[PDB]
Amino acid sequence: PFDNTTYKNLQHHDYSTYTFLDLNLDLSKFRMPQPSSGRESPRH
Template sequence: MAAALRSLRRAQQVLLLPRINATSVRTQSGDSTPESCSAPEEPFNNTKYQNLQHFDYTPFTFVDLDVELAKYRLPQPSSGRPSPRH
Protein backbone atom coordinates (compact mmCIF):
# COMPACT_ATOMS: atom_id res chain seq x y z
CA MET A 1 0.00 0.00 0.00
CA ALA A 2 2.81 2.39 0.88
CA ALA A 3 4.58 1.61 -2.38
CA ALA A 4 1.39 2.34 -4.30
CA LEU A 5 1.04 5.71 -2.55
CA ARG A 6 4.67 6.58 -3.31
CA SER A 7 4.23 5.73 -6.99
CA LEU A 8 1.00 7.75 -7.09
CA ARG A 9 2.72 10.78 -5.54
CA ARG A 10 5.60 10.43 -7.99
CA ALA A 11 3.17 10.29 -10.92
CA GLN A 12 1.41 13.42 -9.66
CA GLN A 13 4.73 15.25 -9.34
CA VAL A 14 5.75 14.28 -12.87
CA LEU A 15 2.41 15.38 -14.30
CA LEU A 16 2.32 18.68 -12.42
CA LEU A 17 5.89 19.80 -13.17
CA PRO A 18 6.08 22.62 -15.72
CA ARG A 19 7.26 21.54 -19.13
CA ILE A 20 10.16 23.36 -20.81
CA ASN A 21 9.58 24.18 -24.44
CA ALA A 22 12.78 23.49 -26.39
CA THR A 23 12.13 26.35 -28.80
CA SER A 24 11.87 28.88 -25.98
CA VAL A 25 15.21 27.97 -24.38
CA ARG A 26 17.94 30.53 -24.96
CA THR A 27 21.67 30.06 -24.68
CA GLN A 28 23.71 31.92 -22.10
CA SER A 29 24.85 34.47 -24.67
CA GLY A 30 21.24 35.44 -25.31
CA ASP A 31 21.07 33.99 -28.82
CA SER A 32 17.98 32.04 -29.67
CA THR A 33 18.03 28.40 -30.68
CA PRO A 34 18.74 27.47 -34.31
CA GLU A 35 15.09 26.55 -34.83
CA SER A 36 13.96 30.13 -34.33
CA CYS A 37 16.70 31.45 -36.67
CA SER A 38 15.51 29.38 -39.62
CA ALA A 39 13.93 30.90 -42.72
CA PRO A 40 10.49 32.45 -42.21
CA GLU A 41 7.55 30.19 -42.93
CA GLU A 42 5.38 30.65 -45.98
CA PRO A 43 2.12 32.49 -45.31
CA PHE A 44 -0.85 30.23 -44.67
CA ASN A 45 -2.89 29.64 -47.81
CA ASN A 46 -6.43 28.48 -47.12
CA THR A 47 -7.75 29.06 -50.63
CA LYS A 48 -6.97 25.47 -51.70
CA TYR A 49 -8.78 22.67 -49.86
CA GLN A 50 -6.29 19.91 -49.06
CA ASN A 51 -8.74 17.03 -48.47
CA LEU A 52 -9.33 15.88 -52.03
CA GLN A 53 -11.57 12.98 -50.96
CA HIS A 54 -14.12 15.55 -49.84
CA PHE A 55 -15.00 16.31 -53.45
CA ASP A 56 -15.42 12.64 -54.44
CA TYR A 57 -18.75 12.38 -52.59
CA THR A 58 -21.97 11.92 -54.55
CA PRO A 59 -25.61 11.76 -53.39
CA PHE A 60 -25.25 7.94 -53.36
CA THR A 61 -21.96 7.71 -51.45
CA PHE A 62 -23.67 6.78 -48.18
CA VAL A 63 -25.78 4.11 -49.90
CA ASP A 64 -22.73 2.69 -51.66
CA LEU A 65 -20.87 2.35 -48.37
CA ASP A 66 -23.96 0.95 -46.64
CA VAL A 67 -24.36 -1.77 -49.28
CA GLU A 68 -20.64 -2.54 -49.29
CA LEU A 69 -20.47 -2.97 -45.50
CA ALA A 70 -23.77 -4.89 -45.17
CA LYS A 71 -21.96 -8.24 -45.36
CA TYR A 72 -20.17 -7.46 -42.07
CA ARG A 73 -23.35 -6.77 -40.08
CA LEU A 74 -24.62 -9.19 -37.47
CA PRO A 75 -28.06 -10.72 -38.10
CA GLN A 76 -31.10 -9.15 -36.43
CA PRO A 77 -31.87 -11.02 -33.19
CA SER A 78 -35.22 -12.78 -32.99
CA SER A 79 -37.35 -13.42 -29.90
CA GLY A 80 -38.83 -16.59 -31.41
CA ARG A 81 -42.41 -15.27 -31.37
CA PRO A 82 -44.25 -14.22 -34.50
CA SER A 83 -44.38 -10.49 -35.08
CA PRO A 84 -47.71 -8.79 -34.25
CA ARG A 85 -47.56 -7.04 -37.61
CA HIS A 86 -47.75 -10.31 -39.57
Protein backbone atom coordinates in the same frame (compact mmCIF):
# COMPACT_ATOMS: atom_id res chain seq x y z
CA PRO B 1 7.73 15.90 -42.20
CA PHE B 2 5.18 17.20 -39.69
CA ASP B 3 2.53 19.06 -41.69
CA ASN B 4 0.09 21.29 -39.81
CA THR B 5 -0.87 23.67 -42.63
CA THR B 6 -2.97 21.63 -45.08
CA TYR B 7 -6.54 20.41 -44.68
CA LYS B 8 -6.34 16.62 -44.91
CA ASN B 9 -10.10 16.10 -45.32
CA LEU B 10 -10.26 16.55 -49.08
CA GLN B 11 -12.18 13.33 -49.71
CA HIS B 12 -15.70 14.75 -49.39
CA HIS B 13 -15.14 16.82 -52.53
CA ASP B 14 -15.37 13.51 -54.42
CA TYR B 15 -18.63 12.19 -52.93
CA SER B 16 -21.66 11.53 -55.11
CA THR B 17 -25.35 11.19 -54.22
CA TYR B 18 -25.15 7.44 -53.55
CA THR B 19 -21.94 7.50 -51.48
CA PHE B 20 -23.59 6.78 -48.11
CA LEU B 21 -25.84 4.08 -49.52
CA ASP B 22 -23.05 2.38 -51.47
CA LEU B 23 -21.05 2.35 -48.24
CA ASN B 24 -24.03 0.73 -46.51
CA LEU B 25 -24.15 -1.87 -49.30
CA ASP B 26 -20.42 -2.44 -48.88
CA LEU B 27 -20.79 -2.81 -45.10
CA SER B 28 -23.75 -5.21 -45.45
CA LYS B 29 -21.39 -8.23 -45.39
CA PHE B 30 -19.36 -7.39 -42.26
CA ARG B 31 -22.34 -7.16 -39.92
CA MET B 32 -23.73 -9.60 -37.37
CA PRO B 33 -27.01 -11.48 -37.98
CA GLN B 34 -29.96 -9.33 -36.94
CA PRO B 35 -32.18 -10.20 -33.97
CA SER B 36 -35.76 -11.26 -34.49
CA SER B 37 -38.88 -10.40 -32.53
CA GLY B 38 -40.42 -13.71 -33.59
CA ARG B 39 -43.04 -12.15 -35.88
CA GLU B 40 -42.81 -10.58 -39.32
CA SER B 41 -44.19 -7.21 -38.18
CA PRO B 42 -46.28 -5.86 -35.28
CA ARG B 43 -49.25 -6.20 -37.68
CA HIS B 44 -48.56 -9.93 -38.16
